[PDB]
Amino acid sequence: ANPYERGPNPTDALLEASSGPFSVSEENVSRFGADGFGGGTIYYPRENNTYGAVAISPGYTGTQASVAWLGERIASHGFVVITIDTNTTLDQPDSRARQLNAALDYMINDASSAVRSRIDSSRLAVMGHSMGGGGTLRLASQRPDLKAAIPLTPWHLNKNWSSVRVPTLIIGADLDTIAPVLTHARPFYNSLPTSISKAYLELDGATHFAPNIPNKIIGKYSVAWLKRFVDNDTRYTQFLCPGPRDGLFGEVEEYRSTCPFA
């Protein structure tokens, strides 16, 4: 009885695959054409329906090519996704938060009818790598209307994210030297309220740049999080609770959550 469910019933193998079950088309946004951000690429499922919309920001000196694989993969599970370039490659996290917001507004208002016709504008999510993940936290902390937030190896000088009320999955990299989990990802997760839906997934043997190439674990749990909270799709709770295995032979260095989720 959930009107937001899309696609067949999930399995571990389906979420680890390099494509979800939807064929995908693309629409480009030029730098000049984009107000408030540096342009981007919108990926959308071809199959006629409305879907949640996601904006993804790269990090410092990063371009949309650094998150492109992940944007396309998420879209192939039934989402409209824009991977953005930023106004300049040196923009700081709080600027990237404004550009994430601009990108969502662009998809809803100024993209073509192929895109707008496929977006449920009431179901929006944000993601970002590094300073883009910092921008994800900042925007989520200002925007309780957002349905989900996924900071990937996030970087931010502010360590206190107690005002976030959005369901938030933080992915860290254990060997991160650029945004060390000791002083970024872990304090961020610890400052999120315990009353919200949240999770911390620390990749094993991973550098800061693990999100920038195809990664089955990042893909699987990013999609499961978006399905669970953008679509309210309880078929995906099984992957999040109790979640990935936490050690020898396991998927991840560590996993924490507020399971069970409301």
The strands making up 168-173's β-sheet, listed across from edge to edge, are 24-29, 40-45, 80-84, 51-57, 119-129, 148-152, 168-173, 198-203, 254-257
Of 78, 97, 82, 197, the C-alpha closest to 138 is: 97
176 is catalytic: yes
Dihedral over Cα of 173, 176, 181, 182: its sign: positive
To Ca ion, the closest distance from the beta carbon of 132 in angstroms equals 17
CB burial string 68-87: b at 16+ within 10 A, e below: bbbbbbbbbbbbbbbbbbbb
Site residues (vs Ca ion, CB under 5 A)? 34
Which C-beta is closer to Ca ion: that of 34 or that of 127?
34
Q: Which of 77, 156, 184, 208 is catalytic?
A: 208
Give me the residue whose beta carbon is nearest to Ca ion: 34
CA 44 to CA 74: how far, in whole Å?
10
Which C-beta is closer to Ca ion: that of 35 or that of 145?
35
To Ca ion, the closest distance from the beta carbon of 152 in angstroms equals 23
Q: Which of 95, 130, 141, 222 is catalytic?
A: 130
Which C-beta is closer to Ca ion: that of 34 or that of 126?
34
18 is catalytic: no
To Ca ion, the closest distance from the beta carbon of 108 in angstroms equals 17
To Ca ion, the closest distance from the beta carbon of 76 in angstroms equals 27
Find out whether 200 is annotated in a ligand binding site. Answer: no
CA distances from 159 to 40, 98, 189, 192 (A): 29, 19, 9, 10
Strand-pairing partners, residue 20, are none
Which C-beta is closer to Ca ion: that of 40 or that of 52?
40
User: Structure tokens of 99?
Assistant: 């550009």
145 is catalytic: no
Beta carbons of 195 and 164 less than 8 angstroms apart: no
To Ca ion, the closest distance from the beta carbon of 113 in angstroms equals 22
Which C-beta is closer to Ca ion: that of 26 or that of 110?
110
Q: Which of 85, 91, 120, 176 is catalytic?
A: 176
Of 45, 46, 111, the C-alpha closest to 79 is: 45
Residue positions in the annotated binding site for poly(ethylene terephthalate)?
60, 131, 155
List active site positions: 130, 176, 208
